[PDB]
Enzyme design. Structure first.
Site, PDB file in Angstrom:
ATOM      1  N   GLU A   1      65.484  -0.870  43.983  1.00 33.78           N
ATOM      2  CA  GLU A   1      65.222  -2.222  44.570  1.00 33.78           C
ATOM      3  C   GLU A   1      63.918  -2.231  45.562  1.00 33.78           C
ATOM      4  O   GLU A   1      63.291  -3.205  46.022  1.00 33.78           O
ATOM      5  CB  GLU A   1      66.412  -2.941  45.155  1.00 33.78           C
ATOM      6  CG  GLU A   1      67.320  -3.223  44.109  1.00 33.78           C
ATOM      7  CD  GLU A   1      66.963  -4.335  42.961  1.00 33.78           C
ATOM      8  OE1 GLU A   1      67.568  -4.600  42.129  1.00 33.78           O
ATOM      9  OE2 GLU A   1      65.876  -4.833  43.116  1.00 33.78           O
TER      10      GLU A   1
ATOM     11  N   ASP B   1      60.087 -10.865  42.939  1.00 31.86           N
ATOM     12  CA  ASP B   1      60.726  -9.738  42.304  1.00 31.86           C
ATOM     13  C   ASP B   1      60.076  -9.657  41.154  1.00 31.86           C
ATOM     14  O   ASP B   1      58.981 -10.454  40.581  1.00 31.86           O
ATOM     15  CB  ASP B   1      62.037  -9.880  42.204  1.00 31.86           C
ATOM     16  CG  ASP B   1      62.501 -11.159  41.195  1.00 31.86           C
ATOM     17  OD1 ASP B   1      63.943 -11.603  41.211  1.00 31.86           O
ATOM     18  OD2 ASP B   1      61.821 -11.727  40.549  1.00 31.86           O
TER      19      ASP B   1
ATOM     20  N   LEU C   1      67.795 -11.729  45.967  1.00 29.16           N
ATOM     21  CA  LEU C   1      67.475 -12.738  45.397  1.00 29.16           C
ATOM     22  C   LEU C   1      67.673 -14.108  46.208  1.00 29.16           C
ATOM     23  O   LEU C   1      68.742 -14.230  46.810  1.00 29.16           O
ATOM     24  CB  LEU C   1      67.871 -12.995  44.119  1.00 29.16           C
ATOM     25  CG  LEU C   1      67.648 -14.484  43.504  1.00 29.16           C
ATOM     26  CD1 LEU C   1      66.087 -14.259  43.004  1.00 29.16           C
ATOM     27  CD2 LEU C   1      68.356 -14.571  41.962  1.00 29.16           C
TER      28      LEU C   1
ATOM     29  N   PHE D   1      74.234  -5.973  39.812  1.00 31.49           N
ATOM     30  CA  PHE D   1      73.440  -6.348  40.976  1.00 31.49           C
ATOM     31  C   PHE D   1      72.159  -7.146  40.258  1.00 31.49           C
ATOM     32  O   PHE D   1      71.574  -8.032  41.168  1.00 31.49           O
ATOM     33  CB  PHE D   1      73.175  -5.039  41.923  1.00 31.49           C
ATOM     34  CG  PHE D   1      72.629  -5.416  43.043  1.00 31.49           C
ATOM     35  CD1 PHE D   1      71.171  -5.666  43.012  1.00 31.49           C
ATOM     36  CD2 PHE D   1      73.007  -5.337  44.362  1.00 31.49           C
ATOM     37  CE1 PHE D   1      70.399  -5.773  44.311  1.00 31.49           C
ATOM     38  CE2 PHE D   1      72.502  -5.439  45.541  1.00 31.49           C
ATOM     39  CZ  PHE D   1      71.006  -5.611  45.447  1.00 31.49           C
TER      40      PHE D   1
ATOM     41  N   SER E   1      77.714  -3.270  23.954  1.00 33.99           N
ATOM     42  CA  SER E   1      77.334  -2.048  24.719  1.00 33.99           C
ATOM     43  C   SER E   1      78.542  -1.865  25.593  1.00 33.99           C
ATOM     44  O   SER E   1      78.914  -0.563  25.753  1.00 33.99           O
ATOM     45  CB  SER E   1      76.183  -2.350  25.811  1.00 33.99           C
ATOM     46  OG  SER E   1      75.042  -2.432  25.016  1.00 33.99           O
TER      47      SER E   1
ATOM     48  N   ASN F   1      72.360   1.214  22.364  1.00 37.30           N
ATOM     49  CA  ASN F   1      72.584   0.008  22.329  1.00 37.30           C
ATOM     50  C   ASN F   1      72.111  -0.925  23.329  1.00 37.30           C
ATOM     51  O   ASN F   1      71.341  -2.074  23.632  1.00 37.30           O
ATOM     52  CB  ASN F   1      74.039  -0.585  21.938  1.00 37.30           C
ATOM     53  CG  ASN F   1      74.254  -1.894  21.655  1.00 37.30           C
ATOM     54  OD1 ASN F   1      74.651  -2.561  22.554  1.00 37.30           O
ATOM     55  ND2 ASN F   1      74.077  -2.475  20.442  1.00 37.30           N
TER      56      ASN F   1
END
Length: 162
Positions: A11, A20, A32, A104, A117, A132
């Protein structure tokens, strides 16, 4: 390596409001602020999050405070989610951090929808789960970061972050 160092790599750290990868106002270590196109709305969220009038700039300590809250919130979201908690509980500590990373980035509800998945991960079919996971908007929009997270699920090692 640990989840905090992993997410700091993925990040970055910026002390002024930036957009972002989805174009949304963000600050700190991937915090965010809002999906609103209004910079003033993002500044209002930031002041509320920090508890003072910032006008768009924060300190490194403030950024790390939001980061700790956001990592905590990701774990909390996993453990309260009926689809994510069994998967998380089934995993080793390295792969648990890969799941936290996804939550996150995309949120609890987004990752909980990766039903096939999640099942391959719970079955410990690591190469199949990895194949996947890459069939996703997530992978196409952030392929280098998704490749690191997927390699972590596939191997149970930190090799992609070394």
């Amino acid at each position: 390596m640990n989840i905090f160092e992993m997410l700091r790599i993925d990040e970055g750290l910026r002390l002024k409001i930036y957009k972002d990868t989805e174009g949304y106002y963000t600050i700190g270590i991937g915090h965010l602020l809002t999906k609103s196109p209004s910079l003033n709305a993002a500044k209002s969220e930031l002041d509320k999050a920090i508890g003072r009038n910032t006008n768009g700039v924060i300190t490194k300590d403030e950024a790390e405070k939001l980061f700790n809250q956001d990592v905590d919130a990701a774990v909390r979201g996993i453990l309260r989610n009926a689809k994510l908690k069994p998967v998380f509980d089934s995993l080793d500590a390295v792969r648990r951090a890969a799941l936290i990373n996804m939550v996150f980035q995309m949120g609890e509800t987004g990752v909980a929808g990766f039903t096939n998945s999640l099942r391959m991960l719970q079955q410990k079919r690591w190469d199949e789960a990895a194949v996947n996971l890459a069939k996703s908007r997530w992978y196409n929009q952030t392929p280098n970061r998704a490749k690191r997270v997927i390699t972590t699920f596939r191997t149970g090692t930190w090799d992609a972050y070394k």
